[PDB]
Amino acid sequence: SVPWFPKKISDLDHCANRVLMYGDADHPGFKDNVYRKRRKYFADLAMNYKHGDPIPKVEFTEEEIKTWGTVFQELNKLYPTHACREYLKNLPLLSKYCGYREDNIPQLEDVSNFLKERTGFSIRPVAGYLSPRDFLSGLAFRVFHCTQYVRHSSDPFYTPEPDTCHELLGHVPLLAEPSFAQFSQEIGLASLGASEEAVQKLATCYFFTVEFGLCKQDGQLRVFGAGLLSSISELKHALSGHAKVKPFDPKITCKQECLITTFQDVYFVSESFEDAKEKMREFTKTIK
Ligand SMILES: CCc1nc(C)ccc1OCC(=O)N1CCc2nc3n(c2[C@@H]1c1ccc(Cl)cc1F)CCCC3
Ligand SMILES: [Fe+3]
């Protein structure tokens, strides 16, 4: 029989709270009590959120805003030569309408309203790590589960855990692009009630596009993966000559191991978002 899956956007209330929350022995904020309390604060906001709520606005601390500023300033030096054209198009809109600035962390609620207007995407705050199945299921309704906390200030370059900087600078600009939003939703739609194997394969295809994808644009390689776009060192590494790259090809790509504590071993290059979408459509037919 088919496993439980959401049939409407509010059904995400029943899975979006199935998470692994902070407390991570080697995490940089682990021995910091103020940080632990702060992470609990963010976790509770997510756990108590229900669909239809405005996303609680947060007053970020001076320390949090500086950490954001440090990350934001370095990445912006790189985007013009590293990010795909779609990302560059949308980022200035975010600055103008959502308050993206070195000295200000954008509110998820504002970003959510921006995306609802542009592509029908919306944000739901998430307390911690969701299963691949639950995470993908949100995409079926154009819902992106977003962490709201900030990485520990001791290491502004700590990326193996997604934080709000990753969400806001890595994912959001692409979710505001129609072709990309369609591509993402179709991964979610394919995952709904699918087999475990199918969910694994879709999650890996997602990983090597939405999180670590490269694309070829006017004969040059650019970056569209969120994980690269929020990671100063890997963003540089990926477009350097030292990285190994292969064509995006779902039946091959879905077998590749997804790495978290290190740079990827390989990056997959999609021709365009429209083409990646077509390739997934052919692929999803084979996994039922
Ligand atoms: C379909 C995405 C996903 N895949 C897996 C294997 C586990 C969970 C999951 O969704 C929730 C989740 O933990 N993640 C999705 C969002 C995300 N964005 C990033 N990350 C994640 C995170 C995630 C964790 C582990 C793995 Cl293997 C993949 C992930 F996408 C990790 C670090 C780079 C930036
Ligand atoms: Fe991500």
- In degrees to the nearest 10, what's the CA dihedral of 81, 173, 251, 280? -130
The residue nearest atom 20 of ligand 1, judged by CA position, is 162
Q: Is 260 annotated as a binding residue?
A: yes
Q: How far is the CA of 277 from the centre of ligand 1 (A)?
A: 20
The yes-or-no answer on residue 211 being catalytic is: yes
171 is in an annotated binding site: yes
Q: Whose CA is nearest to atom 9 of ligand 1?
A: 132
248: nearest Cα among 210, 209, 283, 197: 209
DSSP the chain: -PPP--SSGGGGGGTTT--B----TTSTTTT-HHHHHHHHHHHHHHHH--TTSPPPP----HHHHHHHHHHHHHHHHHHHHHB-HHHHHHHHHHHHHH--BTTBPPPHHHHHHHHHHHTS-EEEE-SSBPPHHHHHHHHTTTEEEE------TT-TT--SS--HHIIIIIIHHHHTSHHHHHHHHHHHHHHTT--HHHHHHHHHHHIIIIIT-EEEETTEEEE--HHHHT-HHHHHHHHSTTS-EEE--HHHHTTSPPPSSS--S-EEEES-HHHHHHHHHHHHHHT-
Closest CA to 146 of 272, 235, 16, 276: 16
Protein residue with its CA nearest to atom 18 in ligand 1: 162
First vs last C-alpha separation in the chain: 14
The answer to whether the annotation marks 230 as part of a ligand binding site is yes
Contact partners, residue 33, CB within 8 Å, separation at least 6: none
Ligand 1 pocket, residue 5 CB under 6 Å: no
Candidates 197, 201, 194, 171; CA nearest to 184 is 171
How do beta strands 220-223 and 214-217 pair? antiparallel
Q: Give every CB contact of residue 204 below 8 A, 6+ residues apart in sequence.
A: 253, 254, 255, 256, 258
Spell 232-270 as b/e; 16+ CB within 10 A means b.
bebbeebbeeebeeeebebeebbebeeeeeebbeebbbb
Asked whether residue 100 is marked as a ligand-binding residue, the answer is no
261 is in an annotated binding site: no
Q: Is the CB of 258 under 6 A from ligand 1?
A: yes
Q: Are 175 and 224 in contact (CB under 8 A)?
A: no
Residue at 223: amino acid letter: V
Catalytic residue (one of 82, 145, 152, 171): 171
The structure was resolved experimentally with: X-ray
> 20 CB less than 6 Å from ligand 1?
no
User: What is the C-alpha separation between 244 and 267, in angstroms, rounded?
Assistant: 6
Q: Which amino acid is at 139?
A: L
What is the residue whose two structure tokens read 């569209």? 224
Question: In angstroms, rounded to a whole number, what is the distance separating the alpha carbons of residues 247 and 261?
Answer: 24
13 near 203, Cβ under 8 Å? Answer: no
Q: Whose CA is nearest to atom 14 of ligand 1?
A: 129
Residues forming a β-bridge with 216? 221
Distance, in Å, from the CA atom of 150 to the CA atom of 130, rounded to the nearest integer, reads 18
The reply to whether 166 belongs to the active site is yes
**Rounded-to-integer distance, Cα 94 and Cα 73, Å:** 15
Instruction: Identify whether 242 is a catalytic site residue.
Output: no
Single-letter amino acid code for the residue at 98: C
Residue of 3, 254, 235, 27 lying closest to 128 (CA atoms): 27
Closest CA to 84 of 212, 217, 210, 177: 217
**Cα 107 to Cα 51, 60, 229, distances in angstroms:** 17, 10, 19
Annotated resolution, angstroms: 1.9
Residue type, 152: H
Ligand 1 contact via 162 beta carbon (within 6 Å): yes
Q: For ligand 1, atom 15, which residue shows the shortest CA distance?
A: 135
Q: How far is the C-alpha of 191 from the C-alpha of 204, rounded, in Å?
A: 12
Q: Is the CB of 108 under 6 A from ligand 1?
A: no
Residue 109 Cα, ligand 2 centroid: separation in angstroms? 18
- 171 catalytic per annotation: yes
